[PDB]
Receptor-interacting serine/threonine-protein kinase 1
Amino acid sequence: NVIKMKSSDFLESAELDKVSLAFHRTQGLMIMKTVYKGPNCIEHNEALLEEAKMMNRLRHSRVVKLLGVIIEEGKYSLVMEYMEKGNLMHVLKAESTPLSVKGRIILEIIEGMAYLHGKGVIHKDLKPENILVDNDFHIKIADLGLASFKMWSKLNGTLYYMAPEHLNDVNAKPTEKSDVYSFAVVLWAIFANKEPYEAEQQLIMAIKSGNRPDVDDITEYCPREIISLMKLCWEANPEARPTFPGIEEKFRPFYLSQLE
Amino acid sequence: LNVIKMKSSDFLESAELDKVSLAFHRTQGLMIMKTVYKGPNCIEHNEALLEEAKMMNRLRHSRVVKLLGVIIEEGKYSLVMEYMEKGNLMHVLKAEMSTPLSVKGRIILEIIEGMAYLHGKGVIHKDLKPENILVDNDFHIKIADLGLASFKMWSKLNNEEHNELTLYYMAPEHLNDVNAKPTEKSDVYSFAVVLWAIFANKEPYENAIAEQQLIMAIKSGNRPDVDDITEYCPREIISLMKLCWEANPEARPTFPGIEEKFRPFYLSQLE
Ligand SMILES: Cc1ccc(CNC(=O)C2CCN(C(=O)c3cc(Cl)ccc3Cl)CC2)cc1
Ligand SMILES: C[C@H](NC(=O)c1ccc(C#N)n1C)c1c(F)cccc1Cl
């Protein structure tokens, strides 16, 4: 179960924009978030470690693997796999992705979210920043803000992807349909190549009042069946929105016949 | 959803195959029907049989077969699965003799993806073999349990007196063992002989004469002749199969372990 790491395992560690590049002795390049550095904490190590164990049980080709956890005297860090091309929005913005690649990106997003929901894991904050892209344009879904992990989160454009049921009511526990809304605005982002809603306080009333992204800003050719999908995936009533198994059953045929 | 309980009237026609039968549904298209029992009207095992069909319908993944429905009628019991056009894996290997390494590598990766799902649900496949690896029109695969190994109640309903109707892939621990208690490693052994079959385009052990000659010789160390598959199998796949068919099961890896290494190898070398 455990891969408890030590700081000693890493030869060097170059800082990033507390996220940090880190070269492991036997295992190569990795990315390390040191979430806390301070006094020796009250005994929540077991809780933190059990939570890290739960992150580590999430093992799937389209989901990021937590490779290890470092809990030293006044130093708490998590360690993940190195993804070369970074987040999805950076890949969309940096230079001209083909429809075949984006279609596959969508299929891998669906495959990954389906796994997550299949493990009883709702993603509270799904968005392009949380979709990391490797060297060969294959993706992995991530929770870089630690939204779903309560204890690590406590130890430390997000409103745009959040469902209107949550904009109304902060006490509302999310569901499988919460993420399908997010997935819809992700789809729009994938064909718009930009973050939506190009003021913060004012916008929240409009979205709860029915507003969605401007579809006429998708100046790139997006297929009708994908535009159909996002409209359905962002419906205001959650019971109207499909499940990810329902989306996969339809979209996998569509990918292979038309997109691939 | 639940399982769709179907009626016989739902199918327009049903032509027999190698009791497996091709069957066209009214609204829902071409399907394959295994009619497991036809005889007198059975004792109330229906609830159990239906519960069993419900339970095996929870097994939902891109690389395993969907039970589409179940027919429970007076003295006629059938399961209905999805139609896979190119048939089982060995039929694809033999009838083509035309399959690229890239496609075979992908077929292996799909077998790994599927077995990983099954084991991830706590389901051991007792009888894994090429006959149980079904191939669609686009050479994509789905794993199946056509002998009803994992379906205890339906398998018992077949063997019924009243009804009017593997050794090559078996791990040596299970050879000559009536109390064969399977593990995740049971399937990995089978997976190894499957890999060999994928590159040999044939069943193993074609110079074996007696059955007891085969069973004892395998338990005494024998595997499929690797000299049949130096015609082009990569060394890393031959390495894998040797490892996956090791006589001590503790040496053999898990399917997640196989996937972590093999998926990189597929994309860099094979695809
Ligand atoms: C809902 C859901 C979806 C997918 C997953 C799969 N695992 C994860 O995302 C890990 C969460 C923990 N983590 C990090 O905090 C992290 C963040 C940065 Cl910027 C850099 C380095 C690190 Cl180590 C690693 C990745 C978990 C939950
Ligand atoms: C998920 C798959 N399902 C069938 O094999 C299946 C579906 C329909 C029929 C029929 N007839 N079968 C055997 C399956 C199991 F349920 C149990 C064990 C292995 C596998 Cl591969």
